[PDB]
Design a protein around this ligand. Structure first.
Ligand SMILES: *[C@@H]1O[C@H](CO)[C@@H](O)[C@H](O)[C@H]1NC(C)=O
Lengths: 51, 51, 51
C-alpha cells in the first residue's frame, strides 16, 4: 500500500507546487536504460498544476 | 565497488546538463511588493447636454 | 471660402500643450491648456456634406 513516492528528493514540499498525485511506473534495463541488470527499474513520477 | 547509484544527470528544457553538486535546501530570498494605494481612484472631466 | 469651416474640438490631458492634428485635405495645429477645456479651430473642406 505504499503511496508515499517521495525519497527525500522530490519538489512536492513547496508552497507554489499545489495539488498532485504521487504515482509510479516501471522502467527498462541495460546500458541505454541506465543500469546493468536485466530487471525493471523503479521510476517515480509526480504531476501537478500551476498558474 | 562502493555502494552508490552512480552519477546523476538532469535534463532541463530538453538539454542535458552535468552539474557539480545536486541537492535540495532552503535559502533566504525576497518577494515582490506592489503598493498601488489607489492609483486611479476617481477622476474625470465631462459634461452633459440635451438635443 | 475665405473664413472656412470652424470645428470645435474638446481635449483632456495633464500636459499643457502637446497636440498635432493631421488629416487629408487640410492640416491644422493649435495649442491647448491643462485640464479639460473647449477649443475652436477652422479647417478647409471641399464638400458640402462633411462626413
Ligand atoms: C503650464 O501652464 C501653467 C499655467 O500657465 C504654468 O504654471 C506651468 O509652468 C506650465 N507648464 C509647462 C510645462 O509649461
Amino acid at each position: 500500500s505504499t503511496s508515499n513516492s517521495f525519497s527525500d528528493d522530490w519538489a512536492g514540499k513547496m508552497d507554489r507546487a499545489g495539488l498532485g498525485f504521487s504515482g509510479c511506473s516501471d522502467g527498462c534495463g541495460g546500458a541505454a536504460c541506465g543500469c546493468f541488470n536485466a530487471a525493471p527499474s523503479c521510476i517515480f513520477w509526480r504531476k501537478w498544476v500551476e498558474n | 565497488l562502493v555502494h552508490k547509484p552512480g552519477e546523476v544527470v538532469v535534463s532541463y528544457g530538453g538539454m542535458r546538463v552535468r552539474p557539480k553538486c545536486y541537492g535540495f535546501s532552503r535559502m533566504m530570498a525576497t518577494l515582490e511588493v506592489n503598493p498601488p494605494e489607489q492609483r486611479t481612484g476617481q477622476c474625470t472631466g465631462c459634461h452633459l447636454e440635451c438635443i | 471660402c475665405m473664413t472656412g469651416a470652424k470645428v470645435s474640438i474638446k481635449l483632456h490631458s495633464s500636459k499643457n500643450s502637446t497636440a498635432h492634428v493631421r488629416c487629408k485635405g487640410d492640416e491644422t495645429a493649435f495649442s491647448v491648456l491643462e485640464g479639460v477645456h473647449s477649443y475652436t479651430v477652422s479647417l478647409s473642406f471641399d464638400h458640402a456634406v462633411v462626413d
